[PDB]
Design a protein around this motif. Structure first.
Motif: not given
Ligand SMILES: [Ca+2]
Ligand SMILES: [Ca+2]
Ligand code: NA
Ligand code: NA
Ligand code: NA
Ligand code: NA
Lengths: 479, 479
Positions: A391, A420-425, A450, A454
């Motif tokens: 992160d 990718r976002t912290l949610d995996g996107v 954002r 990640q």
């Protein structure tokens, strides 16, 4: 020191897994320095120190008796796009297939063990290569030189003559044994240190057309520039090592790189005699263990500062980069923490400036196991998506550039490297299959709204027992 | 055929052991063709057919499912000095680190299995790349194309668009499915074969500025050049393969290279419609088994003819040379007999065009065991001088160039490659130590007052159990 390293690894220039394939083309398997100058005919000449061939294994300098030991070698480049590495398009050879020694050495320990280039320049149609005659090596950072000398070439580096110009070192403490040259207008400024890495830097100057004429040198004495070498006073305190100085037109300042104690540092000035701005960390020994050298690439533009860096265990030269502002301050540092994995022997949880990974993973730790240094990350399994990630805080709506080095088992069929976002996107990524050599991948993306992303690399392992290794990951702001 | 091969191997351009390191730089591990043209901005663009990455093993084209199969890739060169190889300085990539497919294909067997480049040219700011859409492969030399098309680029090869311009293959026998372009003054000549390697060559022409306009073509009909493609008649008889045509200022002739049955040959003409002089052997199938392609380098001059050759088992591209006189006759052939070791499975006695070697020697024979082909020589021992040689007739008072490819065990410390008297006294030699990659060595020497010499390579084996391999040895007159 444990200081953060702002600089980013761009390419391995020499040795195993180097894109250049100096090992296969010219028997340059392990070498150091990578001292660069503009030849005046649209090329960059690069000189190296003690160089070994095929039988070298490492870690460190030195090879078996059949290691084709040369004191120095010389390559050329025409490559004006350093973001994607620096291609060598020529070398000085003899026999063809083998980069040759250009400045001869006796190779008698305690007389002259070797001859090591220190700095280069061209003036008109002549190339000049400063060098030191090394009598014997001592402990790390300590060695004895006989003299500093100057070789030259009137054919673009193809052939070399050793001039009669020398700075003798009868008492061991001569202050111009290891030089660094920089032209400004009609003058060449000549920085100097003693032999080894424990003393200060001094400065002299010579009309550009008179580099070989000792009688034309003048030495900064604290007050003015006088005739006697014995009047030179220090302009930068101990400890100083090999040095590189560049006049940067972007910032309108001289830039000086050296290893000072543990870390490579940069200082800046508007006058060669100083004042010199305090050290800024370029690369720390924590991130880049046993680093040394640090030479500016002559074609640096727009505050994008490329340089060569050496490292003992892999005994090979790396192209690096950092960014300065118009005041010569380092900006837009690598935002990845522990970029070369050297700071830990275990993964973390991916938060607070740590790495994380899926089973099975770890930090391989062994002499020269890294791309650089002794550590790399790995992940390995025989089922599903297997990744390594961190992160990283970013600025909302800014643009970023992600690079990093990876290789896989031969049976790898589908991996990804990206952000990718912290949610995996996924935000942006590339796709690789099977990667043999250490290979750099490069992804540019918009952070979006954002404040964290990640960064990651991974492999699908549905097809078999598959692994990926990763090192020297960089996230830098664009502009 | 068993015909001698005049041509000399210069370098492996792609794949394992290639100086260029296409495998590590761009995941080009195995490929074919190497179709070259001048980009009109100081470079040579080179296109390739079906290309595989890291997990390719060989022998032959084709790879495991993770083989990163691309139908074609594209690289650039700025190298004006072909004697010592052809350096690639750029590739069209996607992602960075991987040479990408530039002309997409469906990869559906019996619909469109692949898209294969045929010939290339630049006019003004635009690059053009002729290609064929391959419906399905047959036995060797037999396949079905859907059509011949033309892709183009307005940015030096960086990005490509597939044009609407096409030669449909409705009756299976369209005569312009596999093209070769050559420009002469304001005109492009477009040679053409049917799909595969068993029919004749036809010829068309178009104003260079109207290559994408089918309506602008005219087709040689035996008397003049007419508008209808079905009026085109053969100018060169079957069997004709892929072709390359260059206009040669030195000899004031069009030169044509193609695989014609078993061997690659060359024909010459002063007009494109003919007459074409008889085939001259370039490379035989006995010396270069399963060879194919043969594409002229666009910077050939002075009768020094460089070309690219493909070979199935190593599935990669080699740079080759021959020499012509001012009538377009091949001169100064390789004088070494059985240059590639392909003609025997055992050593001979060094006389009458055979090879000889010290204990313990052999011909290693397995698919792609050679530098090229299936055969390479070795010698290996653990005491004394251990060499491989051949007696070669020469002209008194003439100057010669010896090249050849070799590599050693890692523990090799002192070998030599050169020419010597029949009584064993070196005339001109070089000294290598430990050689990892297949590496070319080069020696030029005067024959003296002698009617023969011995070309050799060998290693000293006093330091341990040491071996040397050898292949593709060439001795050619200089000038
Ligand atoms: Ca590392
Ligand atoms: Ca062979
Ligand atoms: Na060294
Ligand atoms: Na580059
Ligand atoms: Na193919
Ligand atoms: Na070359």
């Amino acid at each position: 020191t444990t200081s953060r390293t702002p600089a980013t690894v761009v390419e391995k220039l020499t040795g195993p897994d180097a894109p250049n394939n100096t090992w296969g083309r010219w028997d340059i398997k392990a070498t150091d320095l990578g001292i660069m100058w503009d030849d005046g005919a649209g090329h960059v000449l690069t000189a190296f120190g003690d160089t070994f061939g095929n039988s070298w294994t490492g870690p460190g300098g030195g090879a078996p008796p059949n290691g084709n030991w040369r004191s120095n070698v010389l390559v050329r480049s025409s490559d004006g796009d350093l973001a994607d590495g620096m291609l060598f398009d020529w070398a000085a050879q003899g026999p063809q297939g083998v980069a040759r020694e250009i400045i001869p050495s006796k190779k008698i320990n305690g007389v002259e063990i070797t001859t090591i280039p220190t700095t280069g320049i061209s003036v008109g149609k002549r190339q000049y290569l400063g060098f030191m005659s090394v009598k014997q090596w001592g402990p790390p950072g300590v060695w004895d030189t006989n003299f500093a000398g100057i070789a030259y070439s009137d054919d673009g580096g193809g052939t070399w003559k050793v001039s009669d110009t020398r700075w003798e070192n009868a008492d061991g403490h001569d202050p111009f044994q290891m030089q660094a040259w920089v032209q400004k207008g009609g003058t060449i400024y000549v920085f100097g240190t003693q032999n080894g890495r424990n003393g200060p830097a001094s400065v002299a100057k010579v009309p550009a057309s008179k580099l070989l004429d000792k009688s034309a040198f003048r030495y900064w004495n604290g007050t003015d520039w006088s005739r006697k070498e014995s009047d030179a006073v220090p302009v930068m305190d101990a400890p100083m090592s090999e040095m590189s100085v560049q006049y940067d037109a972007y910032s309108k300042r001289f830039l000086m790189m050296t290893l000072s104690g543990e870390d490579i540092i940069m200082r800046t000035a508007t006058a060669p005699e100083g004042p010199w701005t305090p050290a800024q960390t370029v690369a720390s020994s924590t991130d880049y263990p046993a680093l040394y050298g640090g030479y500016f690439h002559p074609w640096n533009k727009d505050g994008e500062i490329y340089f060569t860096m050496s490292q003992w265990n892999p005994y090979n030269v790396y192209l690096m980069r950092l960014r300065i502002d118009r005041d010569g301050n380092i900006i837009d540092p690598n935002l990845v923490t522990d970029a070369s994995f050297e700071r830990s022997t275990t993964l973390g949880d991916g938060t607070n400036g740590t790495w994380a990974a899926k089973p099975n993973s770890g930090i391989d730790n062994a002499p020269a196991a890294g791309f650089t240094g002794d550590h790399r990350a790995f992940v390995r399994y025989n089922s599903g998506w297997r990744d390594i990630w961190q992160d990283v805080a970013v600025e909302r709506g800014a643009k970023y550039r992600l690079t990093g080095f990876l290789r896989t088992s031969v049976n790898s069929d589908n991996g990804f490297f990206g952000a990718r976002t912290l949610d995996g996107v996924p935000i942006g990524e590339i796709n690789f299959h099977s990667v043999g050599a250490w290979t750099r991948f490069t992804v540019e993306f918009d952070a979006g709204d954002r404040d964290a992303v990640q960064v990651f690399g991974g492999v699908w392992t549905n097809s078999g027992d598959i692994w990926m290794q990763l090192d020297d990951v960089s996230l830098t702001k664009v502009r």
